[PDB]
Write a protein that binds this DNA or RNA. Structure first.
Lengths: 116, 101, 65, 88, 65, 271
RNA sequence: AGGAGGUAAAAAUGUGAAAA
RNA sequence: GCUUGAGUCUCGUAGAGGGGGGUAGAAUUCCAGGUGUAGCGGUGAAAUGCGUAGAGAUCUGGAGGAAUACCGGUGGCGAAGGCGGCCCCCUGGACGAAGACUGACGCUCAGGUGCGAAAGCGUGGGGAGCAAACAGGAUUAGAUACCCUGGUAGUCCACGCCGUAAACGAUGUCGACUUGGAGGUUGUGCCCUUGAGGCGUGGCUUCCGGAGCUAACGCGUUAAGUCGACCGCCUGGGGAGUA
């Protein structure tokens, strides 16, 4: 358990699913939970509400590691991405900072031609 | 002869040898009868982003007017010198003077 | 319609990053002429100064490294 | 693109004087020197078609001058082409 | 693209994200470039753009208001 | 360079030979020609241990020193020479002291260029120096695997190697076979790339063209009799078996890599 | 007034003669 | 012979114009290792597919080819096609001002010639991502399609070939003449540069409109208006732009 003091809640959110992972400041993850793992699958899985429940399931078992204050790193858009944020704060942790990092290219790889 | 605005960064450890680098290229400058204008070494300056490593670098400005042939030879050295990092050159624009800082 | 070298004729440099900061956002993105109001001729000169500064690691391409 | 000093050298040899910069004779030679200079450039790269269009242009333009000069003065026509060596 | 709001925040208010590119740039970089519609997409847009200013200029005449 | 002769006669139609006008036409340097006796693939026991070899034209061994031990002595290339044994072209170089030797001709080499060896050589084509001084990401050829061995890697026509990493005592090279192999950093290597890269485009054209090169006809396995090859037999071109060697070793898939002594040098095996 | 987010699974067919 | 035609020279200007050699960041993908783990992923929903071997998720290092967010705008350049990360080397054209120089050297043109998106083909390299054909899962009456998961040629580079597009402002090219308004853009001149201005002058170019023109829609100082020169082309539709 080691009883760490500060961890980083990496929340990789997509237009279809949202993974919640409270890692360590070192990056070595100590636990995670997903919107799909919290029950809701399919349409209900891709909702801001589902994002909120996933936050709590991940917020649990981290107090075991004793993370008091933590950093939040959100990645990519999606139905949640902002609903689970307050749900993570309501969990009872000190939100030190929220750094939004996204894979925004400078016109690199080729995008698909889907969605017709 | 054309004017140039040579500028490059140096590894902090090799920052101690910057005079020698300048003096060597100054020999190249005199070896080309190039009308050197500036020599404003801005010193050990921190970068906007870590270039593979090194948060801090060592900027140096030359801004020298020189013959076409020598400028070709000079840049090849930078690509084969492990001390120098990011060594670009510019065009004439009527030889300049004083620094910005 | 903002003031520039339109009357006080001068030349644009890249070393004056302080002034270059006046034409970029927090993420270091080139601010369009629709906001600056500056002329297109100097806007291109401004953009070249930014890319030169970005290459010399003066002004970051993006925030996080 | 020829050097200004070179163009000054050409005019000082063909026309009546340096002021005859726009004379028919100098116009021919000036275009010729440019072609020979670009001949080496187009010898390689084989892709500067836009630049080549400029070349083919000054070729036809130089061609037109000679045709005019011939009907104008048969003598000077042959006099210019021998000091420049272009007909073959 | 970062917010801290040290001590007195008690709320997100990280609108700076949406103020720059957040999802607007990702909403379109996801697919189909074609290099042909982008031109016509804005030509149809800027067509109405100039016509949007054209509409507002020829208003003063009636309706009793 | 690459030229295709006109179809004057059958067998001369698909003939495409590589011509090189820079090649010195004349008898080679005598002091560097040891006689070489071909064997047609027969060992001490005289049995044909390596089939398909035999005949061909008489060749003389060109003593080319790829060991490159002369250090600090500048040398100008006198001329380039055609080598019947090699795949590329050799270049007759002359050291300042008055000693002529042969070397593999790099891509950028002319009859008048000046190269040298040592730890202070200039980064130029044909120059040989310890890989600890060579800039990463560059391209070199004629590389050694043992310090002072002689040079085994990349010595074929139009071939080279790509130096990638340099972790202290070792250097990771990306061989031309698309494989990453480590090697002692203190090994020497000629900087540049082997010339005559058009040797590949050469098409023999006729059967005899391969014969005088020294290669005897190859007999297909499916044509032999049951006792002569695991294949063959039957009535008309029927296979029915898994492709193997004339000795019974599974071909088309069987990896015969079994050394283990030099395994800790293979970073990323080719694929 | 100015710029951004959200918005539809299936939905086939209809033959050949009438205008002061 | 002259000069208002065309052209040359001197002096500046803006520019994704063309070609070659290097190089930077983001991203994607793969590889190696650590932590850690029951789902991941996709859609309208779902499934195929990856995964207790131990993925996805997350962190460090490295290897790669291609494409260059913002700048960027009915902005500019180019004959057209088409060309936008930056630096350097060679180079084309156009535009504006003040004079000088040649003295109609002009315009156009069958044949002919050069160039010419993409796809496609030949030889040799390269291959991340995207993705014809193709496989499978859905949808469906069936789906040989649209959707999703993978995926080859090809897209990339060097060197050749093919010469076709709704190659289109659907408007041939050159010159002249016939009221304006709001713009953008780049040079040049004068005035108190007192102050982002006041008074003008060319080119390019955007939209709205008078006269006149048209079948009408609309065009409209860059005309489909009014004249002149040369050139290509049309003669009902299908056949067919085939034999």
């Amino acid at each position: 358990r080691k009883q760490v003091s500060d961890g980083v809640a990496h929340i990789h959110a997509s237009f279809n699913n949202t993974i919640v992972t409270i890692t360590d400041r070192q990056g070595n993850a100590l636990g995670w939970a997903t919107a799909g793992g919290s029950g809701f699958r399919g349409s209900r899985k891709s909702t801001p509400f589902a994002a909120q429940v996933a936050a709590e399931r991940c917020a649990d078992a981290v107090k075991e590691y004793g993370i008091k204050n933590l950093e939040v790193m959100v990645k990519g858009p999606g139905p949640g991405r902002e609903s689970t944020i307050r749900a993570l704060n309501a969990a009872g942790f000190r939100i030190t900072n929220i750094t939004d990092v996204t894979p925004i290219p400078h016109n690199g790889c080729r995008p698909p031609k889907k969605r017709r | 002869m054309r004017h140039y605005e040579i500028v490059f960064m140096v590894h902090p450890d090799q920052s101690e040898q910057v005079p020698g680098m300048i003096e060597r290229y100054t020999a190249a400058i005199t070896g080309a009868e190039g009308k050197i204008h500036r020599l404003e070494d801005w010193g050990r300056r921190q970068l906007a982003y870590p270039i593979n490593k090194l948060h801090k670098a060592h900027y140096v400005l030359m801004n020298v007017e020189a013959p076409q042939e020598v400028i070709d030879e000079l840049e090849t050295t930078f690509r084969f010198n492990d001390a120098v990092i990011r060594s670009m050159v510019m065009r004439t624009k009527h030889a300049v003077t004083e620094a910005s800082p | 319609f903002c003031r520039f070298t339109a009357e006080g004729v001068q030349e644009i440099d890249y070393k004056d990053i302080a002034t270059l900061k006046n034409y970029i956002t927090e993420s270091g993105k080139i601010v369009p002429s629709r906001i600056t109001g500056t002329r297109a001729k100097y806007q291109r000169q401004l953009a070249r100064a930014i890319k030169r500064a970005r290459y010399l690691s003066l002004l970051p391409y993006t925030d996080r490294h | 693109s020829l050097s200004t000093e070179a163009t000054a050298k050409i005019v000082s040899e063909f026309g009546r004087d340096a002021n005859d910069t726009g004379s028919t004779e100098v116009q021919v030679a000036l275009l010729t020197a440019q072609i020979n200079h670009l001949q080496g450039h187009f010898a390689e790269h084989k892709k500067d078609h836009h630049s080549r269009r400029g070349l083919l242009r000054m070729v036809s333009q130089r061609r037109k001058l000679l045709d005019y000069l011939k009907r104008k003065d048969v003598a000077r026509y042959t006099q210019l082409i021998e000091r420049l060596g272009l007909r073959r | 693209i970062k917010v801290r709001e040290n001590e007195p925040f008690d709320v997100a208010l990280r609108r700076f994200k949406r103020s720059c590119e957040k999802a607007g740039v990702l909403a379109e970089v996801r697919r189909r470039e074609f290099y042909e519609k982008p031109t016509t997409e804005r030509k149809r847009a800027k067509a109405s753009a100039v016509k949007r200013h054209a509409k507002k200029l020829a208003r003063e005449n009636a309706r009793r208001t | 360079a690459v030229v295709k002769c006109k179809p004057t006669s059958p067998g001369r139609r698909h003939v495409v030979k590589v011509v090189n006008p820079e090649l010195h036409k004349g008898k080679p340097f005598a002091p560097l020609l040891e006689k070489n006796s071909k064997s047609g693939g027969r060992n001490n026991n005289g049995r044909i241990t390596t089939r398909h070899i035999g005949g061909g034209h008489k060749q003389a061994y060109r003593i080319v020193d790829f060991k490159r031990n002369k250090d600090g002595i500048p040398a100008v290339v006198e001329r380039l020479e055609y080598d019947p044994n090699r795949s590329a072209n050799i270049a007759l170089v002359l050291y300042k002291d008055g000693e002529r030797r042969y070397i593999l001709a790099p891509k950028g080499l002319k009859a008048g260029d000046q190269i040298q060896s040592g730890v202070d050589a200039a980064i130029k084509p044909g120059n040989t120096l310890p890989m600890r001084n060579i800039p990463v990401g560059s391209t070199v050829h004629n590389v050694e695997m043992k310090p002072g061995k002689g040079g085994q890697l990349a010595r074929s026509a139009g071939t080279y190697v790509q130096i990638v990493a340099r972790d202290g005592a070792y250097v990771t090279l990306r061989l031309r076979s698309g494989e990453m192999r480590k090697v002692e950093a203190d090994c020497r290597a000629t900087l540049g790339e082997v010339g005559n890269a058009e040797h590949m485009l050469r098409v023999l054209g006729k059967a005899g063209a391969a014969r005088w090169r020294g290669v005897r006809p190859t007999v297909r396995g499916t044509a032999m009799n049951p006792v002569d090859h695991p294949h063959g037999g039957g009535e008309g071109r029927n296979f029915g078996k898994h492709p193997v060697t004339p000795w019974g070793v599974q071909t088309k898939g069987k990896k015969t890599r079994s050394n283990k002594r030099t395994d800790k040098f293979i970073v990323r095996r080719r694929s």
